[PDB]
Structures are given as C-alpha cells and as structure tokens.
Design an enzyme around this catalytic site. Structure first.
Site, PDB file in Angstrom:
ATOM      1  N   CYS A 148       4.888   3.695  -2.446  1.00 24.43           N
ATOM      2  CA  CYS A 148       5.047   3.336  -1.038  1.00 24.43           C
ATOM      3  C   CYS A 148       4.552   1.942  -0.660  1.00 24.43           C
ATOM      4  CB  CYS A 148       4.351   4.358  -0.146  1.00 24.43           C
ATOM      5  SG  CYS A 148       4.492   3.952   1.600  1.00 24.43           S
ATOM      6  N   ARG A 167       2.003   1.421   2.963  1.00 24.99           N
ATOM      7  CA  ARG A 167       0.678   2.040   3.017  1.00 24.99           C
ATOM      8  C   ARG A 167      -0.410   1.382   3.888  1.00 24.99           C
ATOM      9  NH1 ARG A 167      -0.977   2.987  -3.010  1.00 24.99           N
ATOM     10  NH2 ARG A 167       0.786   1.582  -3.526  1.00 24.99           N
ATOM     11  N   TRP A 223       8.797   4.780   9.461  1.00 27.26           N
ATOM     12  CA  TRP A 223      10.069   4.173   9.841  1.00 27.26           C
ATOM     13  C   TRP A 223      10.714   3.556   8.599  1.00 27.26           C
ATOM     14  CZ3 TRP A 223       5.375   2.635  12.123  1.00 27.26           C
ATOM     15  CH2 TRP A 223       4.764   1.517  11.520  1.00 27.26           C
ATOM     16  N   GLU A 258      16.483   0.163   2.472  1.00 33.00           N
ATOM     17  CA  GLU A 258      16.707   1.566   2.090  1.00 33.00           C
ATOM     18  C   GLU A 258      18.102   1.990   2.523  1.00 33.00           C
ATOM     19  OE1 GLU A 258      13.370   4.498   2.573  1.00 33.00           O
ATOM     20  OE2 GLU A 258      12.551   2.933   3.875  1.00 33.00           O
TER      21      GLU A 258
HETATM   22  C1  HEM Z   1       5.437   3.598   8.269  1.00 37.53           C
HETATM   23  C2  HEM Z   1       6.534   3.165   7.632  1.00 37.53           C
HETATM   24  C3  HEM Z   1       6.785   3.359   6.182  1.00 37.53           C
HETATM   25  C4  HEM Z   1       7.538   2.522   5.419  1.00 37.53           C
HETATM   26  C5  HEM Z   1       8.215   1.264   5.922  1.00 37.53           C
HETATM   27  C6  HEM Z   1       7.573   3.044   4.092  1.00 37.53           C
HETATM   28  C7  HEM Z   1       8.282   2.434   3.054  1.00 37.53           C
HETATM   29  C8  HEM Z   1       8.610   3.152   1.915  1.00 37.53           C
HETATM   30  C9  HEM Z   1       9.718   2.873   1.066  1.00 37.53           C
HETATM   31  C10 HEM Z   1      10.718   1.759   1.258  1.00 37.53           C
HETATM   32  C11 HEM Z   1       9.717   3.785   0.052  1.00 37.53           C
HETATM   33  C12 HEM Z   1      10.710   3.882  -1.103  1.00 37.53           C
HETATM   34  C13 HEM Z   1      11.685   5.045  -0.854  1.00 37.53           C
HETATM   35  C14 HEM Z   1      12.904   5.116  -1.768  1.00 37.53           C
HETATM   36  O1  HEM Z   1      13.359   4.110  -2.368  1.00 37.53           O
HETATM   37  O2  HEM Z   1      13.491   6.221  -1.914  1.00 37.53           O
HETATM   38  C15 HEM Z   1       8.598   4.625   0.278  1.00 37.53           C
HETATM   39  C16 HEM Z   1       8.277   5.642  -0.586  1.00 37.53           C
HETATM   40  C17 HEM Z   1       7.319   6.572  -0.242  1.00 37.53           C
HETATM   41  N1  HEM Z   1       6.593   6.619   0.896  1.00 37.53           N
HETATM   42 FE1  HEM Z   1       6.508   5.361   2.325  1.00 37.53          FE
HETATM   43  N2  HEM Z   1       6.873   4.181   4.034  1.00 37.53           N
HETATM   44  C18 HEM Z   1       6.341   4.441   5.256  1.00 37.53           C
HETATM   45  C19 HEM Z   1       5.576   5.540   5.663  1.00 37.53           C
HETATM   46  C20 HEM Z   1       5.196   6.607   4.848  1.00 37.53           C
HETATM   47  C21 HEM Z   1       4.519   7.773   5.254  1.00 37.53           C
HETATM   48  C22 HEM Z   1       4.136   8.069   6.687  1.00 37.53           C
HETATM   49  C23 HEM Z   1       4.290   8.549   4.118  1.00 37.53           C
HETATM   50  C24 HEM Z   1       3.621   9.873   4.037  1.00 37.53           C
HETATM   51  C25 HEM Z   1       2.606  10.254   4.827  1.00 37.53           C
HETATM   52  C26 HEM Z   1       4.864   7.829   3.016  1.00 37.53           C
HETATM   53  C27 HEM Z   1       4.868   8.215   1.694  1.00 37.53           C
HETATM   54  C28 HEM Z   1       5.804   7.703   0.780  1.00 37.53           C
HETATM   55  C29 HEM Z   1       6.076   8.406  -0.486  1.00 37.53           C
HETATM   56  C30 HEM Z   1       5.424   9.665  -0.983  1.00 37.53           C
HETATM   57  C31 HEM Z   1       7.024   7.709  -1.134  1.00 37.53           C
HETATM   58  C32 HEM Z   1       7.620   8.039  -2.500  1.00 37.53           C
HETATM   59  C33 HEM Z   1       8.849   8.956  -2.427  1.00 37.53           C
HETATM   60  C34 HEM Z   1       9.506   9.213  -3.780  1.00 37.53           C
HETATM   61  O3  HEM Z   1       8.871   9.170  -4.864  1.00 37.53           O
HETATM   62  O4  HEM Z   1      10.726   9.497  -3.817  1.00 37.53           O
HETATM   63  N3  HEM Z   1       5.375   6.657   3.502  1.00 37.53           N
HETATM   64  N4  HEM Z   1       7.920   4.242   1.426  1.00 37.53           N
HETATM   65  N1  LIG Z   2      10.551   4.700   4.903  1.00 40.18           N
HETATM   66  C1  LIG Z   2      10.293   5.723   4.038  1.00 40.18           C
HETATM   67  C2  LIG Z   2       9.029   6.332   3.992  1.00 40.18           C
HETATM   68  C3  LIG Z   2       8.788   7.368   3.083  1.00 40.18           C
HETATM   69  C4  LIG Z   2       9.824   7.781   2.234  1.00 40.18           C
HETATM   70  C5  LIG Z   2       9.632   8.812   1.313  1.00 40.18           C
HETATM   71  C6  LIG Z   2      10.677   9.221   0.477  1.00 40.18           C
HETATM   72  C7  LIG Z   2      11.916   8.587   0.569  1.00 40.18           C
HETATM   73  C8  LIG Z   2      13.071   9.016  -0.313  1.00 40.18           C
HETATM   74  N2  LIG Z   2      12.712   8.951  -1.739  1.00 40.18           N
HETATM   75  C9  LIG Z   2      13.744   9.655  -2.529  1.00 40.18           C
HETATM   76  C10 LIG Z   2      15.139   9.216  -2.096  1.00 40.18           C
HETATM   77  C11 LIG Z   2      16.192   9.993  -2.861  1.00 40.18           C
HETATM   78  C12 LIG Z   2      15.839  10.857  -3.901  1.00 40.18           C
HETATM   79  C13 LIG Z   2      16.826  11.564  -4.586  1.00 40.18           C
HETATM   80  C14 LIG Z   2      18.163  11.413  -4.234  1.00 40.18           C
HETATM   81  C15 LIG Z   2      18.514  10.552  -3.196  1.00 40.18           C
HETATM   82  F1  LIG Z   2      19.802  10.392  -2.851  1.00 40.18           F
HETATM   83  C16 LIG Z   2      17.532   9.844  -2.513  1.00 40.18           C
HETATM   84  C17 LIG Z   2      12.108   7.563   1.492  1.00 40.18           C
HETATM   85  C18 LIG Z   2      11.062   7.145   2.311  1.00 40.18           C
HETATM   86  N3  LIG Z   2      11.270   6.140   3.198  1.00 40.18           N
HETATM   87 CL   LIG Z   3      16.789   7.625   3.066  1.00 40.79          CL
END
Ligand code: HEM
Ligand SMILES: Nc1ccc2ccc(CNCCc3cccc(F)c3)cc2n1
Ligand SMILES: [Cl-]
Ligand code: HEM
Ligand SMILES: Nc1ccc2ccc(CNCCc3cccc(F)c3)cc2n1
Ligand SMILES: C[C@H](O)[C@H](O)[C@H]1CNc2nc(N)[nH]c(=O)c2N1
Ligand SMILES: C[C@H](O)[C@H](O)[C@H]1CNc2nc(N)[nH]c(=O)c2N1
Ligand SMILES: [Cl-]
Lengths: 362, 362
Positions: free
Chosen positions: B65, B68, B237, B242
């Site tokens: 993420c 963070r 958000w 994305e």
């Molecule tokens: C506040 C705005 C936030 C932004 C801009 C942001 C941004 C991102 C982005 C761009 C990703 C990559 C997702 C992907 O490519 O599928 C990501 C992954 C992630 N974010 Fe954030 N995030 C935010 C908030 C949060 C929150 C609130 C949480 C949980 C409390 C969180 C937990 C995660 C987790 C667990 C992933 C990994 C998901 C995975 O492995 O598929 N994020 N974040």
């Molecule tokens: N902005 C954010 C914040 C937290 C997030 C946490 C998780 C994700 C999605 N990560 C997996 C995305 C995905 C997994 C598998 C298939 C697929 F089409 C798409 C997007 C987030 N975007």
């Molecule tokens: Cl998405």
C-alpha cells in the site's frame, strides 16, 4: 581452495557447453587435460569454441537483460593475444568501428586476457567506451552527473574537457605493471551521435539534445568456467527508454523533463496534469524517431518485450530454466502494458555470466 | 497448538499496541486476563481500543500500500454485535454511505464478528462492495472480465444482470448456519459513479466510460493478535492509475487503449509511435480530471508517492522498521519518475495485517 573453486566451475561449464555443442563425448578427455593444466599452472586456457560459446551463455544468463532473444548471434572477438597498450587501444577502436557498422549495430564482445592470480592484465576505467563527461563545481552542473568521478580522475591525468554538456571522455585503461592508466582521445570519425528531434513538434530541436549511437559497456567482468575476464567490453543496441526515460529524464542525470514540457507547450505546474508522464512519452517518441531517421539501430520497449516473450518460449522448448530480474526487466514507462509486468521470474544467478566489479578510481 | 499460536500472537500484539498507546503498565494485567480467557473459552475478545488500533496497525503494515501515510486516521466501525443478515446488510449499506460522504471519501473499516474455531460467522462473497458484473458466452464479452465467476455464482442464485458493461453486482454474503448466501440489490442512491471526460478532448465522452467512486475491499481477512476477522470491509480513495492504467486499460479487463487512441486522434499501428503510452497518459489525465470535476476524492501517483516518502520519514523518526513490496508500490505508469523506483524495501510480513483468503465460489 582457489584451485578447487576453479576446477568445480570448469567441470560444470565444460559439461554444459559441450552438451550444447553436441560434443558430449569429448568432455572426458578435455576435463583431464584441464585438471592437469590447473595442477601444473594454476589455471587453464579456453579453446576458441569454449570462449565464444561461454560469452554467449553469459549473455543468455543475464537476469536483468530484456534483449536476450539474440544471445546466440553475439559476435565474439578473441583478443587474449594483446600485450601492449597500443594493441589494447587499437582493439577498442576496432570494436567501436565494427560494432557500429555504419548504424546497423552488431552485438559484439571483445575479450582481453583474463586475471591470473586475481591479477588483472588489462584494467579498463571507462563505464562505456563512448560516454559523456560530467562536471560539478560552485553549484554549476555540466554534462552527465554519473560521469563526475571518472571525469575528475581523467583530469588528474592531464586530460581536459571542453565543458560542453556532451564532452566525449577519452578511453582510459591501465596495464599490468603500470602504476597509472593511460588515456586516448576518441577519434570523432568513429563515433556516431544522434540529434534528438520530434516527428511533429518542430520546437523540440531547440533543446539541442543528442545521444551516442552505441552503448559499449566496458567495466563488467565476464566469468566463464572459473576464468575471470575482467576486461571484456560488449554492446547491443539501445532500448529507447534507456535514453528517453532515464539518461535524459532522471533528476540525477540530464533532468530534461521541465524543458521538454515547455517545448511541447504544456504547463509543468500540477501533478494532476500528469505533465511528467506526457513529457516522458514525447521525449521517448522523439528518441525512437531520431535513431530511426538517422539509420541507427534501436528497439522500442513494446517490441523488446515481445522479443523477450519469444526468449521465454525458446528457453522452455529447449528445456532450459529461465532466470530473470523482474525489477529490471520491466520498462520504466508503461510497464503494465508489457507481459513482463504480469508474471514473475526466478532471480537465481547462473554461470557463465557478467558481473559488477569495483571501480579502480573512487 | 492452535491455542499456543493464539496466545503467542496475543502477547506480541498487546505489548506493541499498549506501548504505542502509552499504556505499557497495563500490559501485565491484560495479558493475564487474556490467558485465562483463552484457557476458559478457547479465545479472547478485544477491547474497543485494541480493535481500533489493531485495524490501524494492520493498514500501516500493508507492504503493497502506497497510501499508508494516513494509517492513523482510519475510521473504525465496530460491528461485532451483528447476528442477522438484515443487520449485516444494513451495516454494509451504512459503510457505503459514511465512507462515500458525498464525495469527500472517509477511509473506513467495518468489522464483523471474527472466526471461532476457524468457523466464519459472516462470509462475504463480493471482492468489493461496489463492483461491475462480467459476462462471457459465445465469444461475447460484456462488462468486467474479473467479475465473471462471481457474476455467474450470483446468477445461479436468482439474480439477473441487465448485461450493460457496468451492471452493479448485488451484495452477496452467507451467514453461519446457512448453506446458501443471500443477495441484495444495491440502492442506486448510495452509489456515486463518475463519467470519464477529458479536459481538452471533447470526443473522449464518446467512449461512454465511467467508474465507481469508492473502492471498498470486502474479501480480505484482518488479523489482529491471533484473532481472525475474515469479514472486515475497508476503503480508502483511489489512486488514478488503478482505474486509468489497469481497470480500464488491461487487455484482460476493459481493454480500452485502442479506442482511446482513436478518440484522441492518433494511429494505433506502430509500436515505435508509443501509441499505447500516449493513450495511457491521456486516459489517466481524464480519470483524474473527471473525479476532481465531480468532487470525488482521488490522488495522482506523483502526489501519492510524495505522501509515501513522508510515511517512510515518519516511520524512521518513530523508530519503526519500514516494510514494503517494491513491485506493487511502483505505479504502473512513469514509475521511474517516483522516488520509490530508486530505492529498495524489506518485504517481511508484520502483524496485524490484511491477508488474501480463498474464494467461497469457484
Ligand atoms: C486512503 C487512500 C488509499 C490509497 C490512495 C491507497 C493506495 C493503494 C493502492 C494504489 C494499492 C494497490 C492496489 C492494486 O494494485 O490492486 C493499495 C493496496 C493496498 N492497500 Fe491501500 N490505499 C489507500 C487506503 C487503504 C486503506 C484504508 C487500507 C486498509 C485499511 C489499505 C490497505 C491496502 C492493502 C491491504 C493493499 C494490498 C491489496 C492486495 O494485495 O491486493 N489501503 N493501496
Ligand atoms: N485505493 C485502494 C486502497 C486499497 C486497495 C486494496 C486492494 C485493492 C485491490 N487489490 C487486488 C485487485 C485485484 C485482484 C484480483 C483481481 C482483480 F481483477 C483485481 C485496491 C485498493 N485500492
Ligand atoms: Cl479497483
Ligand atoms: C541487442 C540489444 C540489447 C538490448 C536491446 C538490451 C537491453 C537491455 C536493457 C534495456 C538493459 C537494462 C540496462 C539498464 O537499465 O541500465 C540491459 C541490461 C543488461 N544487458 Fe542487455 N541488451 C542488449 C544486448 C546485450 C548484450 C549484447 C549483452 C552482453 C553480451 C547484454 C547484457 C546485459 C547485462 C549484463 C545487463 C545488466 C547490466 C546491469 O546490471 O547494470 N545485453 N539490456
Ligand atoms: N542496451 C543495453 C545492453 C546492455 C546494457 C548493459 C548495461 C547497461 C547499463 N547498466 C548500468 C547503468 C548505470 C549504472 C550505474 C550508474 C549509471 F549512471 C548507469 C546498459 C545496457 N544497455
Ligand atoms: C535505481 C535502483 O537501483 C532501482 O531500484 C532499479 C530498479 N529497476 C531498474 N531497471 C533498469 N532497467 N535499470 C535501472 O537502473 C533500475 N533501477
Ligand atoms: C499481475 C501480477 O500479479 C504482477 O506481477 C503484479 C505486479 N505489480 C503490481 N502492482 C500493483 N499495484 N497491482 C498489481 O495488480 C500488480 N501486479
Ligand atoms: Cl546508457
């Protein structure tokens, strides 16, 4: 221990190399010859066939290289015979000429005598045979920042640059037995350069950007069967992003994105305008267009990735394990538009291979 | 063994959590209470303070993420009290409403009762609370390919989509004791969507693209002190890439780049024209512009990376180890224009954290 390390690598390499050359039956007699030679002399000498195939295998095993499809057509030049600095100079000059090939770049490696007791016979100071100088003094920055320490070392030795942003560094290398390297100015007739223009935007030439045609990396060690070729310059042709997205774009390199944005007529004020991204795309289109227009080989990152997919496919059907470094294979622009981004790669180190080594300056 | 695994994680979490809350003196008495409770019941119940801080720590520890920096302002909703499917539905509806906040998105998590003996109390089938359906039959592709298997599972259960490219999937979840999940159509008044237009290119609206405002991930397990909250939807958000570089761009998603190239008036014929790159940039500018115009929170990748740099700086001065996944942190466009690309990150897994879990369909 050193002898054992050598013998083990030698056994592994000769077996593999001869298998690939359909010479498996000859392995037994060759290894005996080698074992005696190591016992007698502390080392062994590669045949021309072994050296050529070894340099090719080493390219094939370069985890960070997207251009590996063409590993088997590497042009290998055997210069284990050189003994004098004039000979080394002339070999380097020859490499520039034959690799350049009037713009139709030939992937080439020139191989100099290897280390003996870890003792270098020839020690090349250049990062690439053709590279621009860099200067930093009183807040004034000129040329390529990545060349600052080598440039300073050259100027200790009586060289003096003109202090343009594109001064060609001289060749600089040291011979076994000498305390100091020697340096030679590059004949400009050997060096092809490409002025950067844009296909649609006439103003782009106001930036007065250019780059050299051929990247000839001259500071990596080639390792083949436990033999250390510390001096073995090689080249392919550029992938466009290397120049347009890094050399000309990085803040710690030429840092041209703001100036690019201005000449393409967009504001450089707001992150949300994605002006850096747009500038990167246009600069990269300009680089590809310019090289093609001048008749100097180059590949774009999409075509390059498509070639690499074929390398992966070729490896599988040849029954060879594929190794790669995902973090280097992905291009620095639109990486998710290539197949590379969407899979993973085993980053294990396999020999023969090319390796980093310590700078003799700094 | 299960009890020991639980107790060990509990000890580690309570110590760390109470240290951060300046409650170190209370650790001894709390851990005793916990040990008795685990002995007596096989489990333990978090205080509201522990749960809230735990969900925050878990976000802070999410290696992939980039967002963070804002971990400590997470809005935590404690719904461990729900027992009925109407209650679960209404909690999910409430989360959409309060997180959306008329466009000014509040990072929020709603936490449902945790697993008991590995037995789920509530099992959510959606990947996100708001997500588009996907269909594939007789070579015909409609909507979001990534939603194909869930869409098919919904339609087994008597739901039927209109087969537009943007059908909203119903909420679907199963309660402990039921063989089948239930499903509920989303009230459209709760869902903000954004039509994609371009700031300069009027024709861009011909593509009739849109995306939903708030990504509410509802299929990851939150783990806190050995307690498994399999059902705990959360949201931030979007970062613009994305949507513009993946959801709308990937060949296995909406695959819009050729159509984007056509409306922005460039040829899609030659790799060297970098038409995919140019299309990616314009589509991404369009996404950012559209969200801003509608008053729905979004961040661009440059600003996001700058925030993440501050997160790194904050971690160091707080004396906390930084962990990260370089391959996910780099944005899928212009990654080398961010500081992230130019450093490395320790990808160790630290708890509390969010984890993938098996799909109950497929
Ligand atoms: C506040 C705005 C936030 C932004 C801009 C942001 C941004 C991102 C982005 C761009 C990703 C990559 C997702 C992907 O490519 O599928 C990501 C992954 C992630 N974010 Fe954030 N995030 C935010 C908030 C949060 C929150 C609130 C949480 C949980 C409390 C969180 C937990 C995660 C987790 C667990 C992933 C990994 C998901 C995975 O492995 O598929 N994020 N974040
Ligand atoms: N902005 C954010 C914040 C937290 C997030 C946490 C998780 C994700 C999605 N990560 C997996 C995305 C995905 C997994 C598998 C298939 C697929 F089409 C798409 C997007 C987030 N975007
Ligand atoms: Cl998405
Ligand atoms: C034929 C055209 C070739 C192309 C298009 C190509 C492409 C690339 C690119 C883009 C890189 C990344 C460089 C960087 O970011 O600094 C690279 C790395 C590398 N290439 Fe190739 N390459 C080619 C030929 C060769 C040849 C001929 C060799 C050696 C025989 C070679 C060996 C390597 C090695 C060792 C690296 C890693 C360098 C490092 O770690 O810094 N490549 N290649
Ligand atoms: N096209 C190719 C082929 C092989 C290459 C082999 C090596 C390289 C350069 N890799 C290191 C670049 C570099 C290292 C350190 C500092 C610096 F400014 C630049 C580029 C290549 N390009
Ligand atoms: C600069 C730093 O080494 C960075 O992590 C890597 C990432 N991937 C790369 N990939 C390539 N091709 N070239 C590079 O210089 C780098 N730099
Ligand atoms: C698709 C495959 O998992 C790929 O290796 C990774 C690379 N890095 C990524 N990074 C982000 N943010 N999101 C992704 O989906 C992926 N995919
Ligand atoms: Cl280079």
């Amino acid at each position: 221990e050193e002898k054992e390390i050598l013998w083990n690598e030698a056994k592994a390499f000769i077996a593999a190399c001869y298998q690939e050359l359909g010479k498996a039956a000859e392995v037994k007699d060759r290894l005996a010859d080698i074992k005696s030679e190591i016992d007698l002399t502390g080392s062994y000498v590669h045949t021309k066939e072994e050296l050529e195939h070894g340099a090719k295998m080493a390219w094939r095993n370069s985890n960070r290289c997207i251009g590996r499809l063409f590993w088997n057509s590497l042009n290998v030049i055997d210069r284990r015979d050189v003994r004098t600095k004039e000979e080394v100079r002339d070999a380097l000059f020859h490499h520039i000429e034959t690799a350049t090939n009037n713009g139709k770049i030939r992937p080439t490696i020139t191989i100099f005598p290897p280390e003996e007791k870890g003792e270098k016979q020839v020690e090349i100071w250049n990062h690439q045979l053709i590279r621009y100088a860099g200067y930093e003094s009183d807040g004034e920055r000129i040329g390529d920042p990545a060349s600052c320490s080598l440039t300073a070392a050259c100027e200790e030795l009586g060289w003096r640059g003109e202090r343009t942003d594109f001064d060609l560094l001289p060749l600089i290398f040291r011979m076994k037995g000498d305390e100091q390297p020697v340096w030679y100015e590059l004949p400009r007739s050997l060096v092809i350069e490409v002025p950067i223009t844009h296909p649609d935007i006439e103003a782009f030439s106001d930036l007065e950007l250019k780059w050299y045609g051929v990247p000839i990396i001259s500071d990596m060690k080639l390792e083949v069967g436990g033999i250390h070729y510390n001096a073995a310059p090689f080249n392919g042709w550029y992938m466009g992003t290397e120049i347009g997205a890094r050399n000309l774009a990085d803040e710690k390199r030429y840092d041209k994105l703001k100036k690019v944005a201005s000449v393409i007529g967009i504001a450089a004020d707001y992150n949300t305008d994605l002006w850096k991204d747009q500038a990167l795309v246009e600069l990269n289109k300009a680089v590809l267009h310019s090289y093609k227009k001048q008749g100097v080989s180059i590949v774009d990152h999409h075509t390059a990735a498509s070639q690499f997919k074929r390398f992966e496919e070729q490896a599988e059907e040849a029954g060879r394990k594929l190794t790669g470094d995902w973090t280097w294979l992905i291009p620095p622009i639109s990486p998710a538009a290539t197949h590379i981004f969407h899979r993973s790669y085993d980053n294990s180190i396999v020999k023969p291979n090319y390796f980093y080594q310590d700078k003799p300056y700094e």
